[PDB]
Design an enzyme around this catalytic site. Structure first.
Site, PDB file in Angstrom:
ATOM      1  N   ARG D  49      26.375  76.417  49.240  1.00  0.00           N
ATOM      2  CA  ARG D  49      26.162  77.798  48.835  1.00  0.00           C
ATOM      3  C   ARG D  49      26.391  77.969  47.340  1.00  0.00           C
ATOM      4  O   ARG D  49      27.435  77.572  46.805  1.00  0.00           O
ATOM      5  CB  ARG D  49      27.064  78.754  49.629  1.00  0.00           C
ATOM      6  CG  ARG D  49      27.029  80.203  49.137  1.00  0.00           C
ATOM      7  CD  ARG D  49      27.840  81.084  50.065  1.00  0.00           C
ATOM      8  NE  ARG D  49      27.941  82.462  49.593  1.00  0.00           N
ATOM      9  CZ  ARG D  49      28.975  82.971  48.922  1.00  0.00           C
ATOM     10  NH1 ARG D  49      30.032  82.229  48.618  1.00  0.00           N
ATOM     11  NH2 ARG D  49      28.947  84.238  48.550  1.00  0.00           N
ATOM     12  N   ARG D  90      29.257 100.706  40.697  1.00  0.00           N
ATOM     13  CA  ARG D  90      30.471 100.486  39.923  1.00  0.00           C
ATOM     14  C   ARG D  90      30.857 101.756  39.171  1.00  0.00           C
ATOM     15  O   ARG D  90      30.017 102.623  38.926  1.00  0.00           O
ATOM     16  CB  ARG D  90      30.287  99.323  38.938  1.00  0.00           C
ATOM     17  CG  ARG D  90      29.522  98.113  39.484  1.00  0.00           C
ATOM     18  CD  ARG D  90      29.928  96.827  38.784  1.00  0.00           C
ATOM     19  NE  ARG D  90      31.245  96.378  39.234  1.00  0.00           N
ATOM     20  CZ  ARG D  90      31.490  95.220  39.843  1.00  0.00           C
ATOM     21  NH1 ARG D  90      30.511  94.354  40.074  1.00  0.00           N
ATOM     22  NH2 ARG D  90      32.728  94.922  40.212  1.00  0.00           N
ATOM     23  N   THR D 296      33.432  84.572  55.011  1.00  0.00           N
ATOM     24  CA  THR D 296      34.456  85.350  54.326  1.00  0.00           C
ATOM     25  C   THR D 296      35.823  85.234  55.023  1.00  0.00           C
ATOM     26  O   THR D 296      35.919  85.380  56.248  1.00  0.00           O
ATOM     27  CB  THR D 296      33.990  86.830  54.230  1.00  0.00           C
ATOM     28  OG1 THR D 296      33.164  87.005  53.071  1.00  0.00           O
ATOM     29  CG2 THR D 296      35.132  87.758  54.157  1.00  0.00           C
TER      30      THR D 296
HETATM   31  K   LIG Z   1      27.108  86.924  46.190  1.00  0.00           K
END
Ligand SMILES: [K+]
Ligand SMILES: O=S(=O)(O)c1cc(S(=O)(=O)O)c2ccc3c(S(=O)(=O)O)cc(S(=O)(=O)O)c4ccc1c2c43
Ligand SMILES: O=S(=O)(O)c1cc(S(=O)(=O)O)c2ccc3c(S(=O)(=O)O)cc(S(=O)(=O)O)c4ccc1c2c43
Ligand SMILES: [K+]
Ligand SMILES: [K+]
Ligand SMILES: [K+]
Ligand SMILES: [K+]
Ligand SMILES: [K+]
Ligand SMILES: [K+]
Ligand SMILES: [K+]
Lengths: 494, 492, 494, 492
Positions: D49, D90, D296
């Site tokens: 990845r 953001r 994750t």
């Molecule tokens: K990413």
């Protein structure tokens, strides 16, 4: 379930586009000619039975030649079956051709041959020499289709029994006798049988209907009598008495199939128990994957009447519902007045019943009885049938030279026609006793060995298509072989 | 599966300790006396059928009276069924009592009553006035048990049809006619039926075998004909033609049960289709939990012979395999020579068939079809039968006053006897057309209302014990109050 | 299936109206007061655990009295559990309170008590006298929560082993030791245990969490120690090492339930295998119908953080998915900074998981494992649960004085709340370790013996109704008893 | 059932001879060199990845080049995945690089760009211009990984919201924001994504992990962004909020697979619901026969410690039990101290979980859900897996050029290895995200088209033999041509 299937049915729906069950017709003087045989075939006959209880080799030779001429003229393959006369127990002759037996009276039955030609109501001959050592006091002797019933009181000597005449009946010479309680130990095959069987081998008959099979070892005697040149001839065992019913597991294992002879079984076994025996034997054969024939007393009244009884129609339908591969006609075609009409009616009854029969109940019941791990051949054939149900395939094509895998596929009862493509004409004929299968001859001499299988597959697909089973966009399940069938294809019909 | 069960059977194994199927017997000259009826009961009769196609009210009163006496004398409960004549289509009379019809010939059938008493081979009367507006060219008319077949060519006028005689047959006066393709719109009950139905309500009959039922609406007309006094009388619909068959779902809905009248269906429908129609109608009733009777030509040759044909025996066995609650005798008992023997043999065939039959296939097939959520009654009755299989219980005891829950349990086909304990004698009688159930009467007026249910339950278990169904240490599934309470009971 | 159930789920659907899983909280100084305990109960505590590894009888007496005061003030029944200290293996003392063990170094461990108060890095005491006859060369000794690992080289004498220090760790006096490969034969219950257990009997505790159960016979010792007056106290066996895992079938049979002590099991068993052990033990208990508790390392980080890790949340959910009856909190409530919040979060996780769990998979898997014929009690309870599914009943009511049938019904995992109506307050408390059950006390003294059952049935129905489980026109499945429950009713809620 | 299987397990029993699940590793400083990547491969990595949230094109080119070299040197095929940065919301900058937000305080969040470079605790910029028309009073704004939570009170104007600071947190410039209740309508691919996606097509990447996918339509925009040259690149949709979850059926339909991004989901959704969302998304993909990745915080504490927490281990095991094809490593391998050890341990957990997992439950559950009639492909693949169970075959050999039939067989979860024989190297790489499959490359340009299939089948069996999966006398299920031909083969 069958019950759930019954809810969805309508008798005004059109019937299936194929008949799965197969019709065996016994040939006689009514039906021996090539025109009569052609009528039979077109009426629905798949199998021609020769009853070797009557007629001579020349008579049966004529049946064989005529069957073959009739089938060749119509472009089809018809199986030829030799039904053996078998071992018999008969009385001797009587002084005056006759003996009036009376209820309450006492008589004597003798193993002594001296009385063969001079029996009376008081003392007469029976030709089974082991009679006394097989029968005990209390046992019954049935004479003349079980019309005359005798009870054994005692042994007068080593060769003679004292009997009470339990009912009034007048008997004539050479009448057939039955021993209901007893393990008859007559040879499997007689002398006539052994010469008939070699005749059959010489004339290339497809199968033997072996009479009075009571034991597994007896199947071996039919096999030995058929000899090395007869190894490919199917042995169908006729189950005719309690012994055969009691030893059924071992008999089925050794034979290539079974005939349920209801009439014969009924001589010693109450009628309502023979009905059950039929269920047992048919199911055992279904699970073994061996053809089973329902025989005798089928559409009997239609021998001389243009129409059968309702109970007769119902008998035939339920033979199909039991799971019989085959239904057989005897006198109805051998000596009958309506040979074509009885076969046509029998085809109609089978077809109607099939439209009501849930094949999936058969498939599922038989699949459940398989032990894991299955062998490849078994897994392949049950999977193929499974795939028919899952894709709603409209035909199967099975490449089988010996017919073995065709029979294994048929065992699982797909709800569509099976097309067997084979390189042997003898396989085409022999498959005529397996339900749901039609055979296509592929001529390896005229067309090549087709090692890649593509031509045979196209032949089967084309046959299926020409009978209207499949059209463009339908599914067809193909199975093929190296020994058994290990390969499956789901083909989209072009 | 049934197939898997067949593998394990041995025809020498002993038969079951109970016969689930029930036998209906038609009463006639051979069997109307108290001693004959007594012979019939001990032979295995559960229901006395009175065929009202013949006999006066005086004759059937004699049957009614004699049945109740024979039953009381034996201390049992026998149902009494009134089988109606129904609406009919017949020809008229003929000049000379006779008409020789010949293949290829042309004839004329008329709705015009003027020809009722002077028909010939060329032109004759048919008494169904809507005949012409129901029949089209191409259709068939069957006459005299379908022996004579006519094809309709055209309408000569409003009342007359031109017909081809398709086969040679000689007919006499007043012969019955059938219309195979056609939706016959004759009324539900005849004028004679109304008189007969009123008579049956007065004499307290248990059920009606209602003739020639073709649509659901017709069941209600039979209902209306019995009146408020006859509202607890069961109506069993005789299905006799394509309309009954086609409309069977809605007819089963309105009825209390179904008679599959094979012979009458066979006049109009090929025999092989009748065989299949029997399968369909029987299974539909099983699923509805309503009684179904397999009737007509069951053991017919035993009317005059001491033994039936082998095909007749398999026919009886296969009705049981199909799932029939009852099998019926007509002339075999009404006018036959061997009434007792025919019933005893029918009983024996049923018992043999039952011993080979795997009830669990039925239970399971019917279970699989119940929609979820089930209503409480359905859930309780199916569970309790499930409980019989899972604990191998040897009897069920069902407290049912109307018979409803007894019928609901019997629907699920446990593999053990069902004892119904009830406070109504009429329920004892009416349950005689439900397979697998025996009834015990509990006189609440004599013994109390038994609100704790102990006395009725003990009555049930006691009955089961008396019959050899259970002994100490056996399980008995008890169901009671429609039913919503189940008990798994250890027999003391 | 569970997989099929997953397809239909939405995480934005409202959660179930009841929580089936049960929460055990261990009491300590953070939580011993009646106000803290009341906070716990309202947060979701069903069971109060007393860790008898710490504190004295007076301390635990205070826990008991306070629990009872807290439960009485809130009108609920809270179970009280005594977790035994159990037998231990410890090192002795060290010269200078300390011993610096170094990788590669050689040391000597002695069974000789003379060295109890003067151990060094070179030679020190271990208090398990059968140490040498249980350990072989090659075996490992774990010291101080398995941080220090020693390998046994040889027997220097009968009482002394020569060990290699396989890693660098500094140990202090009286540290706990583990024997990974070895069948530790320490007594089931120590002396302290036997006096603690009689204290528990005297104070009427509901259950014992019996430490370090390795064998079935050890369960008998806890039983004998509990005495004749303790016969009704449940014995929950703590499974903490390979032996207990290996003997699990016989342990479950003898005990009243099981605690899976993941942390303890992990000292000698790789973590990924303990995960699997948890699956095995939970399923075995589910099939036995005995409560099973998932314990240690549950929401551990929430002892001092206001929030747990995601992996911790997932651990708790999967305990429920495995089929645990109970989840247990240790330090999180005993010494923690967020006792209320950890119990509340644990309730929320359990409830969320339950909404995703297919109860029918549990019902069906367990029903399939029953042998035919079933005994009445088993058939009645499985049928009752079956009827819940078939009628979509919204509650069950079970009359059970001992709780036995309530546990048998719960075993089958209906997808609705179970309401137990009982005449014993001890049954109400003890049922707090069985999932899916809420108890209703029916006071036979204050209200009569209700031999007809009608009042108790109304009490259960009324409870169900007041919690909103059932309303008018809903189905409720009622079961009741003479010994076990033999009677079932499907009741339409009025 | 799984429960029934659990009863028979012994944790001392030997593990399986193969690991079905697949491991994806994020490459970073710890692992970018050829020897490090080599360590990763031998440790158990199947997919490299590349996280395009950081690093230049030059950096990832180095990763690409190094992966291909490491793989070639070991003679294996490794997939290369491009994980996009995606659209983001953001905050702007703050006066003094900092803003101390206090519980109870009131602040103002503005869509007005003028405040991009001068925000304070009282008023600051948020770069999502549709912010006000998507948020309603009552809604929450999460800032800085959801650490700071704001509640919206009202609209001060068209571009400005009045917010209550619900908790005390000090934020810095450019921190990421989340909108828990809201349907964020940001575009599918950012401007940076387009540049990155074009780069991935040029460098021949095998798959895209497409960030922040919310609807089916967005999958197509990613597709259009890859162009015709990138049409064989798999798009794996990263599901990161309630929209992805809600729209999962239609998203699975359009995608080539799904990544369950637990951490990102957890910013917005309670952790216990995320656990359940993992179960749902994994099972939906199993049923669709598409690869699903559990990603994750898998073994995060092993970034800097030599062993993970016990809870982290159960998390990995339960992803396998859930049915995940792949498990993913992020910082553990990208910036971690123990990259090899973390992968080897991940491998070990998977293998242990697999040994306890009853595959037959999966096969059967998925089978039960197939509609009838099945299409031929479905029927052939499910039968062939059924055949593995029924004959206890020890390997499958699947001839698949695109990987489609290999994925279809893997969907049915046989309890034996699947060997895919393929003529495309890209298929070898892409199957690395499908559990239970290993790929053998057949060079048709070098060896011929093998129209009789013999050479490819022998290649498969040979591979299986080499690996110890089969030996003489074992059964091997062979499937080939999408697939429509099945063979049950005795291994020589
Ligand atoms: K990413
Ligand atoms: O005159 S008929 O042609 O025989 C005739 C035909 C029909 S119909 O064709 O079905 O409409 C009748 C329907 C309903 C009738 C009722 S009912 O109470 O409404 O059920 C009572 C009597 S009653 O005998 O006078 O009590 C009836 C006598 C005669 C009737 C019908 C009656
Ligand atoms: O100007 S932006 O706001 O970044 C912007 C917004 C959207 S939208 O919001 O999804 O409609 C775009 C949709 C589709 C685009 C395509 S496409 O071939 O049609 O897929 C090509 C280019 S290209 O870079 O010029 O080649 C695009 C550049 C910029 C785009 C969009 C592009
Ligand atoms: K013969
Ligand atoms: K059919
Ligand atoms: K009648
Ligand atoms: K039976
Ligand atoms: K403790
Ligand atoms: K649930
Ligand atoms: K496994």
């Amino acid at each position: 379930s069958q019950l759930a299937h019954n809810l969805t049915l309508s008798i005004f729906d059109p019937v299936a586009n194929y008949r799965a069950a197969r019709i065996i017709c016994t040939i006689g003087p009514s039906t021996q000619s090539v025109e009569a045989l052609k009528g039979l075939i077109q009426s629905g006959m798949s199998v021609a039975r020769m009853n070797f209880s009557h007629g001579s080799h020349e008579y049966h030779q004529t049946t064989i030649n005529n069957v073959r001429q009739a089938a060749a003229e119509l472009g089809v393959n018809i199986a030829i079956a030799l039904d053996t006369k078998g071992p018999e127990i008969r009385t001797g002759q009587f002084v005056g051709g006759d003996a009036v037996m009376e209820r309450g009276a006492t008589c004597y039955v003798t193993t002594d041959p001296a009385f063969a030609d001079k029996g009376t109501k008081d003392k007469f001959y029976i030709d089974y020499q082991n009679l006394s050592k097989v029968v005990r006091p209390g046992n019954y002797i049935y004479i003349d289709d079980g019309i005359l019933i005798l009870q054994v009181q005692s042994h007068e000597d080593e060769q003679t029994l004292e009997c009470t005449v339990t009912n009034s009946h007048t008997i004539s010479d050479r009448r057939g006798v039955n021993l209901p309680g007893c393990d008859v130990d007559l040879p499997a095959v007689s002398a006539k049988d052994r010469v008939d069987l070699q005749f059959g081998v010489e004339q290339g008959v497809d199968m033997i209907f072996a009479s009075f099979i009571r034991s597994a070892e007896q199947v071996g005697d039919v096999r030995k009598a058929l000899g090395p040149k007869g190894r490919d001839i199917m042995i169908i065992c006729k189950i005719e008495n309690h012994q055969g019913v009691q030893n059924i597991d071992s008999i089925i294992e050794e034979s290539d199939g079974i005939m349920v002879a209801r009439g014969d079984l009924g001589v010693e076994i109450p009628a309502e128990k023979v009905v059950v025996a039929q269920k047992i034997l048919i199911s055992k054969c279904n699970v073994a994957g061996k053809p089973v024939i329902c025989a005798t007393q089928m559409l009997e009244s239609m021998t001389y009447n243009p129409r059968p009884t309702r109970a007769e129609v119902s008998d035939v339908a339920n033979a199909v519902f039991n799971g019989a591969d085959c239904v057989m006609l005897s006198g109805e075609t051998a000596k009958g007045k309506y040979p074509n009409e009885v076969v046509q009616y029998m085809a109609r009854i089978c077809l109607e019943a099939q439209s009501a029969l849930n094949e999936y109940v058969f498939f599922n019941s038989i699949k459940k009885l398989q032990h894991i791990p299955m062998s490849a051949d078994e897994a392949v054939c049950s999977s193929a049938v499974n795939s028919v149900y899952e894709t709603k395939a409209k035909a199967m094509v099975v490449l089988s030279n010996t017919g073995r895998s065709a029979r294994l596929v048929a065992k699982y009862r797909p709800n569509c026609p099976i097309v067997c493509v084979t390189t042997r004409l003898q396989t085409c004929r022999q498959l005529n006793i397996t339900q749901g299968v039609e055979s296509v001859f592929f001529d390896a001499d005229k067309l090549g060995h087709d090692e890649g299988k593509e031509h045979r597959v196209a032949a089967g697909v084309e046959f299926a298509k020409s009978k209207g089973y499949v059209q463009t966009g339908d599914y067809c399940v193909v199975i093929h072989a190296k020994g058994y069938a290990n390969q499956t294809r789901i083909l989209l019909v072009e």
